[PDB]
A paper describes a structure:
Ucl fimbriae are attachment organelles that facilitate ExPEC adherence. Ucl fimbriae are phylogenetically related to Uca fimbriae from Proteus mirabilis and F17/G fimbriae from enterotoxigenic E. coli (ETEC). Tip adhesins are two-domain proteins; they possess a C-terminal pilin domain that connects the adhesin to the main fimbrial shaft, and an N-terminal lectin domain that mediates attachment to specific ligands, therefore dictating host range and tissue tropism.
Numbering used by the authors: 21 to 42, 50 to 214
The structure:
Amino acid sequence: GPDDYVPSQIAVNTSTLPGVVIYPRVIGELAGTSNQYVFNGGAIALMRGKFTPALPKIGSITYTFHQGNSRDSSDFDIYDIGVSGLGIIIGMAGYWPATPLVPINSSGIYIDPVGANTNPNTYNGATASFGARLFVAFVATGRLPNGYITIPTRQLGTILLEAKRTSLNNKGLTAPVMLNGGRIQVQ
């Protein structure tokens, strides 16, 4: 069917965090991930994605990612992943490389096109897919002990698919945004 878009997740991997050697402060960036087909399957459409955080907000911090097209600094919300002394911040963007990193500092924001945040009629150009880029950074909220800290898998939030044509917009299709657990080495 023309509106038979089906979701697929976007995730970052804890294992990509370098070894922490050192409040609150950023202790490292996970590898940025990309998925051109977070929503795929239907016919060509004008589409946009809205991210909704799923984790409690425990603080805020200024930061600039080294990975994405991040020119200025921004306010990020520190989210709780249920690990003492730790927190994470999120930044998202459209799949295409020129798009800007969208810091997550609210309960809802359009990650692509970023213009939809200031114009409710704005969608991406006609395409048969919607994708995203995911950036995550670990934050130490307090002095961390040396060793291996376990990080559980947590759903960081959800991308909601909106489209110009009402039938696809009415489906309200969503896809999950994931942090894949593992361990981090503090020294």
